[model samples]
Target: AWPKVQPEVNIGVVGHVDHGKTTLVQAITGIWTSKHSEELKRGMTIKLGYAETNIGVCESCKKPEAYVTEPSCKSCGSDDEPKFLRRISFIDAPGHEVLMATMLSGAALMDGAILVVAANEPFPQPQTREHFVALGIIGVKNLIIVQNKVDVVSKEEALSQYRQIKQFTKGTWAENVPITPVSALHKINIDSLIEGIEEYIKTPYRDLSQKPVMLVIRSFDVNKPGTQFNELKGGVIGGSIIQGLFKVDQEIKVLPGLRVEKQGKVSYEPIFTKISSIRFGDEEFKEAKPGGLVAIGTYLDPSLTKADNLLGSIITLADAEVPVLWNIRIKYNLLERVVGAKEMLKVDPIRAKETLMLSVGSSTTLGIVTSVKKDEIEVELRRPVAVWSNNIRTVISRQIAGRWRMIGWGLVEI
Candidate 1:
């Protein structure tokens, strides 16, 4: 069950492959779901998971040690009187290089992130470097560096690892960021890490009066085989609210929705549905605000949402005006180097007719560069997207050496 207190911010965990990022999330939130798929042995798709964390403070405990994820104080036996600090939603991201687009989409929902580095391994592993560059490209300014796996290393060795971390972070945006020592497997120094998160990633001010828009990340069917047709539940779409609020029983619109065949052609039309239920964890809420992840149960057919059929759709009030675009103009910028590439390849400039992958919010599509003028460029999207905001960041990736490589990013100028 999730904490009834709504999460006030989204903090993400990113690191190298097998760096114990998920273990760290379990240490904090204590909620790990097997909802990904049982077909994992049969090429099951792995998606990011977000968990709700309730942080508490104990005055009797030491300063940094006073902050904890548990409801009760870890020490001093103060179970009943520990003061609540804040509720945080943790987005656990995959660290594999092949899933960079997935990681980029997840990062769009994160207000801040924790970079997990294993102390036993060399600082800035392949994915470690890539994920950090992603954070920068995605404009996530609030960061907390985690020196995990301290339990497996000697104190001197850990210190050397820490020094390496400091040296690597020097002259970067995270030069002054806090690097906390942790043993997530053993739950050691988790309190200190929580304290760092509390201090560094302050919740930003939100505007609730604006038009509500939610980026659809996960969509699924909640029915079983034995259930009768009459007892079937509606489709459920899960995502985080980027702005405003959503109320129960309200009419919502999903953009670039269902693909339809018309007169020997194909086009996407928006799907309109009523909110049957709004849920966070097991409990239902009358209204969902802009913090924790929420699941919106809709009246659409279960088949429409089965197996993430509606993934990457944008949701908003029926009356809200969000443009559905098949073509867009962007002003792009290239990074100094290709992220995670061996031999440190320099980023090349964009060229006309070159196809690049672009991710905006939770949606991703292939864009064929139709025109280019140095920093100014225009693209025709193979798949349309809902332009929710003019300033939304779009991550640009190009195929390099038989794989998609992170090259640059841009903003929707038109």
Candidate 2:
């Protein structure tokens, strides 16, 4: 069992499908990402997967290695053992374009990320570029681009792909970021990857004095099917504490809580609950501050918040005034072209009556274009949302390849 309180950082694994990001996550954390039925059927993560491991340095080389998860240092040899080092909580976001919405929602909680690119694959596969762009749009500047599967490619081939990555990110936020080459399967140079992450993706500076807020990524009902009401526990809200702190028995308010529509006005009733308990990576804690994923056992009705039902909801200090947004008007930007499109067509201006999917915070919702004008558009959301911050940039997608494909992004003005 893990410690109840430990230092942690949320580093997301990104890039296109089969880039070995999830494999790397498993290699470091010893957690196979896809365990769900549909996921097992598809052989990829259909939802966010999480695992924790401690990144430690080897005794001989004194360099970081995949130590805690592995018994011995695979990079060096015997006698090169582990020295308890920094703790890492890996956030495994889906790379499949079809699950980009899941990716965005997961990325919402990432402080930094590891952009995995396969050495065998051509530079900038559509989803690779898309994921990188999404990282930039979300302001995740701390990035370490890992060149995975180096064992599968020739040395020259690996260098060639490296150069291609450089050219691809030339003017972007990822330009000139350190690129670590390693094999997640063989666990080669795992130490170098850890070192890069340690240097680049430092723990985010958090202000514990601010109002405590948790951005809910998943909600769960932990009881078994036959469990009786008396033995059943309350709902569990799982996510990261963005700021301040939360204590056991603390009264909290969850916003954009319940959907209610009256007189053409869609409003959400904020749900209030008491925090029964808090846990970090399976270790129970009486109180929590800004850190990695924390599961709050709440006294709310389990049925209403189970199975990620409260995902994208905001939990905050009971008296905090979080705005509930019913209708939103955005001053937006569309990419010059569409991503993952059959034709890869140049983006046509968003037109009225066209419905588009929006990824804001952890919510993936759709809205119909009520009106469109140069530099601005109006959208009436079918569901209300909690606005946690000002100038939230939303990833906008259109239906393509039978799914909501990444099209562009917009900033909500009001």
Candidate 3:
């Protein structure tokens, strides 16, 4: 007889750069899945990786390093050591600003998220707050706050930081979240982290039905010998199914062409196909439901599927008027311009001002401060974009003297 287990849930890890996100996963799962060349060069995980493990301490190994088969700890010489494992699957993302897209890719596919904040840091850094804002925008309700690097700071300092986090999360879902203080380096309080996740798993089963919508985050064709002209070799679509059931032989639409739409019109065509295969983690399912990471295969060219495009089912909101308020001060990274005015700003192409390009999500357009005030400014975009009432950061570049430099940042509001 085999033991019965409940279905698996997808979880994501997020934090500021160099905050031990990769190490936490490695410590828990004993697998270093982050695939960054620089990280490998430095003998540490950078970002963008995955691992699966059971949430139990290994009986054979006494420490974190012993979990890995190669066992890098020269000080602890033992090959037969047991390693701790967790039953959960993970998507690890980079903490660097340049890797924001990678972080969004992972967040868009996760059932929930674990926000890792370093205790030694003064408070939530820019990127740390930015990641949390992104999570709120995407409506990820399940959250756990991990105060890493606790070993470096005194309990008083850690508690103070935790209180700051509590104050910061006042109105957000994390307001009541349990902030577990742990040191991945010292492997402390790891069990508490697992227990927090297990509580969600013990709930009664409910219908997991939803509309079959998955965002395409990554796509590329792999060259193969017998590939036909229309048939692309390989491509990977990393996104969670937002609703409904996604099954084999489902006809789906790949919307909004990756390239510019000529004549201001875009055609979304349905690519009729069956799921050649599907993968979540170590397990394979012929079908997938809402709330789990999924990778699907298609016969069509992967190039057609670009980041931010929807798959499975297509839906769009028209006249989605997101109020543009200037009361909130903005720090535009490219122009290094900060604006807070009620007056409207004019938006033009970067080609005109030769300003550096700034993008939100997948849309890139030019923005200029048209009007300014003591506490607000009106910004008229060259084109309308989809933005929610949350913190959005865009990067722009300006030429100073003769060289280009990042000016500042901007905040959008109602």
Candidate 4:
């Protein structure tokens, strides 16, 4: 049954290679899905999983022992458990360096974040440092630091780890942030962690009167092998509800929807489809608002949406105006060096005939460099990259070691 309460907060767990982001998710939401193909064996998250949870308190217990994820107290077996704090859609993003772009995209949906740090390991690993900057660049300001794996480390060792954490965050947005001690594996101090989240992370009130626009993160075919052609169901698209409200049975327009082959050139055409069903979890909703992840069932062709083929498309109202461009000019800040590079070397400036990958919102496209225009600027794009704000800030990456390595970010003046 649906908790019926759409999550009020979207809190993402982000940090180092295995700083216990997914472990914290498992502790809070009690769900660990086998979505990512790799990293499961190593206790790492390769895919982003946003699971819903309700944190309750057990007030009967003594000081510091009163918080819990469940409504009832398991330790004292008391009926008077913790009071309901807040319903949340908790996103535990993959912590490895290779998935930095994934982290950037998922960060777009978070209202706030819990940056996990393993107390047993050194603080600020590759993703830990990268994700911190990403959170700022991606515009996520609210954050709490969780010093995890505390049970495995001695008090001084844990304290040593904690001190370093304070140092790294000393002069940043998180300088005054709360750092909670946790052993997610054993559920130690989870209650305190929950209390920190509720206190520090507040969801800003949303204005739902705006036009409905959803970024398609993953679209899958719901049909099975034994299913008959006539009995086949439609495609299901999944993503966070960014703004406004999306209603069931309403007509929706998908942009950059179809692959078009014309005049020896390729482009995209808008696809129109109806909202067949709308769901937050197992419970279906007539309409969905912001602050939670949503799965939208549409009557579009199975082939078009299969296997996340429409991953980077946008679902906006048919009348929504988003300009289509094959060529766009951008002004970007180059990094000192490539992220995760062993040696720190200043990244070279942009040059003509260079191709780079652009990831904005849930959409990613390739842009070929032509020339250095004025920093005041113009941009060229063949791929239909999508944006939400008045000025667009997107993460752009370079191909490294057969993977897309995050290089730097770009901004649009207009």
The C-alpha stretches of model 3 lying farther than 4 A from their native spots are 1-7, 36-48, 54-87, 101-105, 171-173, 200-209, 221-236, 257-273, 302-414
Candidate 4 stretches with Cα past 4 Å from truth are: 1-3, 36-43, 58-65, 73-82, 337-339, 373-379, 400-403
Q: Over the stretch 315-364, how does candidate 2's per-residue lDDT look in tens digits?
A: 99789987777678888888888756535678788999998888888888
What are the per-residue Cα lDDT tens digits for candidate 1 across 129-224? 989988987888799999999999998999998888899889998899888999998999887888888899999899999899998888987898
**Candidate 4 residue-wise lDDT, 1-414, digit = tens:** 123567777898898877778878888788774466666666567667778877666667764556665566777667654667667888778877777777877887888999988887766677777788788777788999899999998989988888898998898777898889999999888878877877889877888998888877778877988889887899898887778889988888887778888987888788889999988866688888887788889988788888878877778876788765566667777666774554454566666777777877777777777766635234467676655456677776777666676777778544
Q: State which candidate, 2 or 3, has the greater TM-score.
A: 2
Candidate 3 on 330-404: residue-level lDDT in tens?
443222121111122233223322334334443344455555554344455544443443665443434434433
Q: Which regions of candidate 1 are displaced past 4 Å? A: 1-3, 38-45
Q: What CA RMSD would candidate 1 show? A: 2.1
Find the number of clashing residue pairs for candidate 1: 0
Model 1 alpha-carbon miss at residue 373, Å: 1.1
The deviation in Å at residue 233 for candidate 1 is 0.7
| Local accuracy by lDDT, each model | 0.85, 0.82, 0.55, 0.77
TM-score of each: 0.95, 0.91, 0.61, 0.91
